[PDB]
A paper describes a structure:
Mam1, which is found only in point-centromere fungi, binds Csm1 and Hrr25 independently, through two flexibly linked domains, thereby acting as a molecular tether to recruit Hrr25 to the monopolin complex. We also determined a 3.0 Å-resolution structure of Cg Csm169–181 in complex with the Csm1-binding region of Cg Mam1 (residues 162–216). In the crystal structure of Sc Csm1:Mam1, Mam1 forms an extended interface with Csm1 that includes an α-helix binding to the “side” of Csm1 and a phenylalanine residue (Sc Mam1 F262) inserted into the conserved hydrophobic cavity of Csm1. As these data are difficult to reconcile with our finding that Dsn1 Box 2-3 interacts with the same surfaces on Csm1, we determined a new crystal structure of a Cg Csm169–181:Mam1162–216 complex. This structure closely resembles our earlier structure of the S. cerevisiae complex, but does not include an ordered α-helix or any interaction with the Csm1 hydrophobic cavity. Closer inspection of sequence conservation in Mam1 orthologs reveals very poor conservation beyond the “core” region of Mam1 that interacts with Csm1 in our new structure, suggesting that the additional interactions observed in our earlier structure of the S. cerevisiae complex represented non-specific crystal packing interactions rather than a biologically relevant interface. Thus, our new structural data support the idea that Mam1 and Dsn1 Box 2-3 can bind simultaneously to a Csm1 protomer, rather than competing for Csm1 binding. Interestingly, our structural modelling suggests that Mam1 is positioned close to the solvent-exposed residues on the Dsn1 Box 2 α-helix, suggesting a potential further interaction that could stabilise the ternary complex and explain the role of these residues in Dsn1 Box 2.
Author numbering:
A (entry chain C), D (entry chain D): 166 to 185
B (entry chain B), C (entry chain A): 70 to 116, 128 to 179
């Protein structure tokens, strides 16, 4: 098993939402 | 499972894939890469033309000049480049983040 | 979907994970890493601590010779190291093969 | 999509098969 990395939190960040 | 694969590349490669999706323009990945010293969020697209979209709108002003101190001008601009170059791009992104 | 992840990381980082499997010792990955200059076949295992098993038996003598000039002595032996150091290993590995 | 690489061929290799 692998512990979560710091970068996992950024999945829910707002900048990713736009797909235009 | 594939969550383990994503977990492996965070620690091995310093790159986390949040999402994969395919739209009419092409195939994309929501990607974040870095450590405590520096994190960069972007979109990788594949058309084979490769499209990297840097995400700075939601970025903190305190976080940006530290990136600007560590990262080159072109890394803050949207780019297009061929597939063979992708490893070098990773070497550019990785090296700049560990300054 | 799973394949696109593996395909992206092949070009991005030069690391291809063929299979993953979980046994009594722990969770394992079958990996090959390299470019034209040098390829390295190994197994990555996690128990945290990480285990590195290099597969040198399939390799030819001529293949081993080129790798031995580029690679340090420790890299040819099975290694145990903590998870925090996992990116450090990737660095040295990718960097040595390109040498 | 993403074309094949030299690393993909190595999946079939015999060294990976033995796990002990």
């Amino acid at each position: 098993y692998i512990p979560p990395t710091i970068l996992t939190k950024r999945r829910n960040m707002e900048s990713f939402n736009d797909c235009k | 499972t594939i969550e383990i694969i994503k977990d492996l590349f965070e620690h091995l490669c310093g790159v986390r894939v949040h999402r994969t999706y395919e739209d009419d323009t092409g195939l994309w990945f929501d990607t974040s890469q870095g450590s405590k010293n520096g994190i960069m969020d972007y979109k990788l697209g594949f058309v084979t033309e490769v499209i990297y979209v840097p995400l700075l709108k939601q970025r903190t002003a305190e976080e940006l000049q530290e990136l600007q101190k560590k990262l080159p001008d072109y890394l803050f601009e949207t780019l297009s480049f061929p597939l063979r170059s992708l490893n070098q791009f990773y070497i550019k992104m990785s090296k700049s983040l560990n300054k």
